[PDB]
Amino acid sequence: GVLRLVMELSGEMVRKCDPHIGLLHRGTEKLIEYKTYLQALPYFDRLDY
Amino acid sequence: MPLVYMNIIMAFAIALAGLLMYRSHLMSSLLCLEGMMLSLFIMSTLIILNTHFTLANMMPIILLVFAACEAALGLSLLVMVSNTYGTDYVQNLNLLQC
Amino acid sequence: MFMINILSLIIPILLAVAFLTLVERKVLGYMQLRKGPNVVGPYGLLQPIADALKLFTKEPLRPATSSISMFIIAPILALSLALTMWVPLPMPYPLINMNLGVLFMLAMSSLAVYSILWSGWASNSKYALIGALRAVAQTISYEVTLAIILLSVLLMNGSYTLSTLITTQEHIWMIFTSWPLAMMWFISTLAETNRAPFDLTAGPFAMFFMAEYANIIMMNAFTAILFLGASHDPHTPELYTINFVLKTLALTITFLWIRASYPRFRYDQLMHLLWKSFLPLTLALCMWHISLPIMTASIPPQS
Amino acid sequence: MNIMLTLLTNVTLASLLVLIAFWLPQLNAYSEKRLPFSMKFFLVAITFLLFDLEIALLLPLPWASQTNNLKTMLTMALFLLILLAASLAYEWTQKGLEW
Amino acid sequence: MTMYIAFILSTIFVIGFVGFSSKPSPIYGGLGLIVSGGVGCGIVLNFGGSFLGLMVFLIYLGGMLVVFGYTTAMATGDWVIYDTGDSGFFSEEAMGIAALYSYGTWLVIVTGWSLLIGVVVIMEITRGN
Amino acid sequence: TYKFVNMREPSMDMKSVTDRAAQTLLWTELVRGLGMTLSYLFREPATINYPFEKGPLSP
Amino acid sequence: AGRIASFLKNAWAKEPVLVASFAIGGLAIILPSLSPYTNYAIRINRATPYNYPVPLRDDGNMPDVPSHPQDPQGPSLEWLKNL
Amino acid sequence: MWFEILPGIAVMAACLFIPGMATAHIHKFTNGGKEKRVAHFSYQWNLMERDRRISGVNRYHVTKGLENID
Amino acid sequence: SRGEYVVAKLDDLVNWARRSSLWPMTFGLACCAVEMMHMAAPRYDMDRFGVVFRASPRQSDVMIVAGTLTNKMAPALRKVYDQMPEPRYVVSMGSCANGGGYYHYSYSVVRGCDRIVPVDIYVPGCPPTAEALLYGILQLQRKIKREKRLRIWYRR
Numbered sequence A: 001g002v003l004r005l006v007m008e009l010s011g012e013m014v015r016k017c018d019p020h021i022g023l024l025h026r027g028t029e030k031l032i033e034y035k036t037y038l039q040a041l042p043y044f045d046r047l048d049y
Numbered sequence B: 001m002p003l004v005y006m007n008i009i010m011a012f013a014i015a016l017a018g019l020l021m022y023r024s025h026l027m028s029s030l031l032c033l034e035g036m037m038l039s040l041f042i043m044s045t046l047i048i049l050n051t052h053f054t055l056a057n058m059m060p061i062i063l064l065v066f067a068a069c070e071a072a073l074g075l076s077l078l079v080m081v082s083n084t085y086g087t088d089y090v091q092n093l094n095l096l097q098c
Numbered sequence C: 001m002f003m004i005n006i007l008s009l010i011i012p013i014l015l016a017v018a019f020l021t022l023v024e025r026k027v028l029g030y031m032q033l034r035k036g037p038n039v040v041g042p043y044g045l046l047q048p049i050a051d052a053l054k055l056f057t058k059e060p061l062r063p064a065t066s067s068i069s070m071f072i073i074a075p076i077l078a079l080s081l082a083l084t085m086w087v088p089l090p091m092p093y094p095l096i097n098m099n100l101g102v103l104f105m106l107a108m109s110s111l112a113v114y115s116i117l118w119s120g121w122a123s124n125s126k127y128a129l130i131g132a133l134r135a136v137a138q139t140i141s142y143e144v145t146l147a148i149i150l151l152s153v154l155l156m157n158g159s160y161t162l163s164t165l166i167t168t169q170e171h172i173w174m175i176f177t178s179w180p181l182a183m184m185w186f187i188s189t190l191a192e193t194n195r196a197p198f199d200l201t202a203g204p205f206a207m208f209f210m211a212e213y214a215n216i217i218m219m220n221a222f223t224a225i226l227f228l229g230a231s232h233d234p235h236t237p238e239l240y241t242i243n244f245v246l247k248t249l250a251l252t253i254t255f256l257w258i259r260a261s262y263p264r265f266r267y268d269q270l271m272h273l274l275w276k277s278f279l280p281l282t283l284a285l286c287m288w289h290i291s292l293p294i295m296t297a298s299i300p301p302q303s
Numbered sequence D: 001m002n003i004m005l006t007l008l009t010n011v012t013l014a015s016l017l018v019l020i021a022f023w024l025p026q027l028n029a030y031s032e033k034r035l036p037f038s039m040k041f042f043l044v045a046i047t048f049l050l051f052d053l054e055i056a057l058l059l060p061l062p063w064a065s066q067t068n069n070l071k072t073m074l075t076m077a078l079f080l081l082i083l084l085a086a087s088l089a090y091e092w093t094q095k096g097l098e099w
Numbered sequence E: 001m002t003m004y005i006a007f008i009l010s011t012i013f014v015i016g017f018v019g020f021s022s023k024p025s026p027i028y029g030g031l032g033l034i035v036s037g038g039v040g041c042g043i044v045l046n047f048g049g050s051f052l053g054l055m056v057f058l059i060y061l062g063g064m065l066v067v068f069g070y071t072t073a074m075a076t077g078d079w080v081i082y083d084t085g086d087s088g089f090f091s092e093e094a095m096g097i098a099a100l101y102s103y104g105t106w107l108v109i110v111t112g113w114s115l116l117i118g119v120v121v122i123m124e125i126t127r128g129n
Numbered sequence F: 001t002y003k004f005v006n007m008r009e010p011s012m013d014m015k016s017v018t019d020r021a022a023q024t025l026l027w028t029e030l031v032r033g034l035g036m037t038l039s040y041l042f043r044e045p046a047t048i049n050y051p052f053e054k055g056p057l058s059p
Numbered sequence G: 001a002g003r004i005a006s007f008l009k010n011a012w013a014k015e016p017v018l019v020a021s022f023a024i025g026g027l028a029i030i031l032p033s034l035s036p037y038t039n040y041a042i043r044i045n046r047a048t049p050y051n052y053p054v055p056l057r058d059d060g061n062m063p064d065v066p067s068h069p070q071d072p073q074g075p076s077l078e079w080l081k082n083l
Numbered sequence H: 001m002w003f004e005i006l007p008g009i010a011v012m013a014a015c016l017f018i019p020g021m022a023t024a025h026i027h028k029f030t031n032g033g034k035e036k037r038v039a040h041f042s043y044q045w046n047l048m049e050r051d052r053r054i055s056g057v058n059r060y061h062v063t064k065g066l067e068n069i070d
Numbered sequence I: 001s002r003g004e005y006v007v008a009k010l011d012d013l014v015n016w017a018r019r020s021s022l023w024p025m026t027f028g029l030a031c032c033a034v035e036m037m038h039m040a041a042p043r044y045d046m047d048r049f050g051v052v053f054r055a056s057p058r059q060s061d062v063m064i065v066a067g068t069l070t071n072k073m074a075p076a077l078r079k080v081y082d083q084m085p086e087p088r089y090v091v092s093m094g095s096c097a098n099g100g101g102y103y104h105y106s107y108s109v110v111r112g113c114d115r116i117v118p119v120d121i122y123v124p125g126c127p128p129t130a131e132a133l134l135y136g137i138l139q140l141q142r143k144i145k146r147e148k149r150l151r152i153w154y155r156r
């Protein structure tokens, strides 16, 4: 998918790895609060494609 | 002694002078040393081939090998000096003095 | 009429390089339960022409701060070396009949790393330079074993002349005399041309691409000449040409097959592969192939 | 003479093709808008150089096999190859081939 | 006479040495040394030293100057002196060089020992600590 | 119920050791993978000739 | 005895490349001293004429030096023909 | 099917035919209908030079048979 | 006259070359990327049309935005677009890339990738089928076939 990864290495070996997420934060959990249960069902289709 | 030998000797002299100038960048000193090696190789090969000295055809390769070995050594030393200062500049080597 | 011979060697090599891209696409697609390009031209036959015209009419991107000198120098050296590696090859008659043809090919292949080094240096970035250094290390590592395997094999030939490889294999192929050396030679040529499973890395890009491909085809032809000796009739060289071309095509298709069959190594894994599996065995087999002609009183003629 | 002409032709074609590739899209108007120094890479470069020198010594072997002194030649060739193997073994056991 | 082609090559040799001896931007010095080495190998090949010139071309250029470039990137009257007769049914330089394993046993021993000691020495120097 | 995926212990007799050594030195599984890929090339591709052919759909 | 066999067994497993390489190198070292054909190779190298055979001046005291190539005196290469 | 790959391969094959074949023909055209003479080791070159001198037309491949012995 | 005839024919040739080899870079942001790999799958085989699979940004001809563009992601997409050599095209795939789609009224979603980059073809769906995206690609090919640069240059 889409992923940002900030990591520091000592040569070849990975010393620290920090993933940065939120490049696909759409705000599904807040949008769900404005729909009925039937209307909010299709969001879960999109949660995991 | 024709002028080709004069040109090879002059190239060796230029490389030796450039090694002795030492503007900076010890790597350039190594480059001058190895250019000196190359001039020596060319001249010795020319002399040996011209006089049909068959058993001396070994000599250039040997020289090549040995000089290359020294070059390797030099590189290593350069690298180590860099690890102490970050740059291979000549003027970093003044801890010991007369 | 030597210029005509140079042109008739140069131009068809580039044409075959252009159409190898199409074969690479078709063969991979058919191994993947699909097809290759079959729309652009009667059989995708015009796909390379479309690719070339598209590539040459696109905007080129200069770094605007790097050394333009080495930037333009690198593709020249790459393509010139790729085309130069073709003159000593006997198919069945070489364009240039060198005494030490094999050594000349080794020297050109050794020079081939300056292009990688200069492109990485003129990239003006740390990450591209790291990639360039990794590629250079792999290339030099594997050309070591290429040289050792090559001289160990040539110990049965009697010289460095490529034309004598035809005479040595008059009755039997060299694959039967030494198959382990052939396997290591094949893998080392895969790693030398940065082909999968060893692929860890508009205009000049196309130039570099042609050189990589020309090198692939030439390496496979050299492999066929070394280990699969075609039978040559001095009154009909076309039979040798057909046999040699067919074997070269088979080996190139095998390269594509391997690319389609396997994952890729890690850098440390291929470094370990060479240094700890190929080199010890290559040294042992070099000793074996030094001893064998003396042991069996089968030393080749020429000295 | 033939080889110099061949090299000149190859270099000339490469130069012509590169320059036309670099200059064909330059005529039409457009927008027209560190420290690390891993030691292992240097080590592998130096190892390649040393093995290259030993290969250079090994290269005259095809001609070395017609000498009438087959025993001495075989002894010396095997000596050089064993020397190469010893260099490889020493570099191996001293953690010189790691990452 | 092609206007003293040996003299032309030697002059290009000297000019390349002048270029790289000024020591500008060690990468450019390495490029000058590469050009000079190519010219010198050409001189040797034209003189009749096919194997030795190709040995320059392979060893010197392909390995040693390549290691030099690697390390730098990690950081910041002719024609008359010739002979008259022929060589026979062999090349004299190849026979002389091949005589290394039969005649030059002492040379082989000392060179191999020096190379092994060089491997040992390089590791010790770079071990650090 | 549960299953073990990687709980085999290789045999240690001379024959099994030599089979593993032959696999290591003669590249048997790599040739097997090549053979699998070779088979795929000879069988019919799954590509349809769009736009002259259309993927199946339903009401 | 047992230790050597067990070590060879444990090297043939998990390290077969080194075992094969060492075996091939050791064979290359030992076998040439035991083969009966190496002397034939030395003789074949001795029998290849690279230079002109300079004739000797007859002084009436050379029974073993032929006066013509077709004379029976001198070295023969029947062993080479039969090989 | 898979023989759709054959045309392109065939095309490349023809390309790889052109160099080798061409060489032979040039070597027949510039050497009087014979293979180009191989001159290694400087004795073969001496034979070539002698042939060129005695040809009478400054071309080594013009061979002189017993018709020229008089 | 011949002066315009040669430019018409040369423009035809250049357009055919450009369209017949389209190398796309892909922003597989979300679930439309799945239908794009399905258009790359054996059944549809985009590669047989001259459209290679997963080219690099520096040798790409068209960008396919397949998924939602969030406010955290927009600068990276604009930068990748700016790296692309010209001539370059953008294909917007799915509702999320077209106009925001199911997340249009969200505090963290860009309401259409055309607020960031100019778009040439809009492929509608949630997700568009592999066939729909193939239709969009062939429509882009026709759009390229329609263009005429040498004629405009000659007439100015």
Ligand SMILES: CCCCCCCCCCCCCCCCC[C@@H](O)O[C@H](CO[C@H](O)CCCCCCCCCCCCCCC)COP(=O)(O)OCC[N+](C)(C)C
Pocket (backbone or CB within 6 Å): D069, D072, D075, D079, E102, E103, E105, E106, E109, E113
């Ligand atoms: C005698 C003192 C020994 C104790 C002191 C030790 C000092 C250091 C050891 C090194 C000295 C080794 C002496 C060998 C000299 C070589 C020359 C001599 O042996 O004759 C040769 C005999 O050859 C022998 O086979 C030499 C083989 C010995 C080398 C193998 C092992 C060497 C290891 C020595 C140390 C190197 C590194 C350490 C490794 C453990 C010549 O052979 P031949 O064909 O008649 O003549 C050729 C001339 N022709 C062509 C005109 C006919």
Ligand SMILES: CCCCCCCC/C=C\CCCCCCCC(=O)O[C@H](COC(=O)CCCCCCC/C=C/CCCCCCCC)COP(=O)(O)OCCN
Pocket (backbone or CB within 6 Å): C180, C182, C183, C184, C186, C187, C197, C223, C227, C258, C262, C273, C277, C278, C281, C288, F024, F025, F026, F027, F030, F031, F034, G014, G015, G016, G017, G020, G024
């Ligand atoms: C009595 C006297 C006889 C003389 C002795 C002869 C006996 C010889 C018997 C042994 C010879 C075998 C040597 C052949 C090469 C072996 C090298 C090797 O074993 O390396 C492999 C690794 O080799 C590879 O994996 C390379 C594969 C690269 C991917 C590409 C696959 C391509 C395979 C397709 C077939 C290739 C066909 C080659 C022939 C071409 C001919 C031109 C081992 O690595 P690992 O298993 O990971 O572990 C090592 C540490 N224990």
Ligand SMILES: CCCCCCCC/C=C\CCCCCCCC(=O)O[C@H](COC(=O)CCCCCCC/C=C/CCCCCCCC)COP(=O)(O)OCCN
Pocket (backbone or CB within 6 Å): C276, C279, C280, C281, C283, C284, D082, D085, D088, D089, D092, D093, G008, G011, G015, G018, G019, G020, G021, G022, G023, G024, G025, G026, G029
């Ligand atoms: C005696 C003849 C001499 C000439 C032959 C030599 C030819 C070239 C071979 C030598 C190359 C250099 C070898 C260097 C050896 C280093 C061993 C080593 O350090 O590896 C150890 C392990 O290796 C060992 O155990 C030591 C060697 C094992 C023994 C090898 C075979 C010895 C002899 C067996 C055969 C004997 C004769 C054949 C018998 C059959 C009958 C003919 C650790 O491996 P790693 O990959 O670093 O770690 C793995 C974990 N990540």
Ligand code: SF4
Pocket (backbone or CB within 6 Å): A046, I030, I031, I032, I067, I068, I093, I094, I095, I096, I097, I101, I102, I125, I126, I127, I128
């Ligand atoms: S909601 Fe529609 S546009 Fe968004 S990821 Fe899913 S299929 Fe694609």
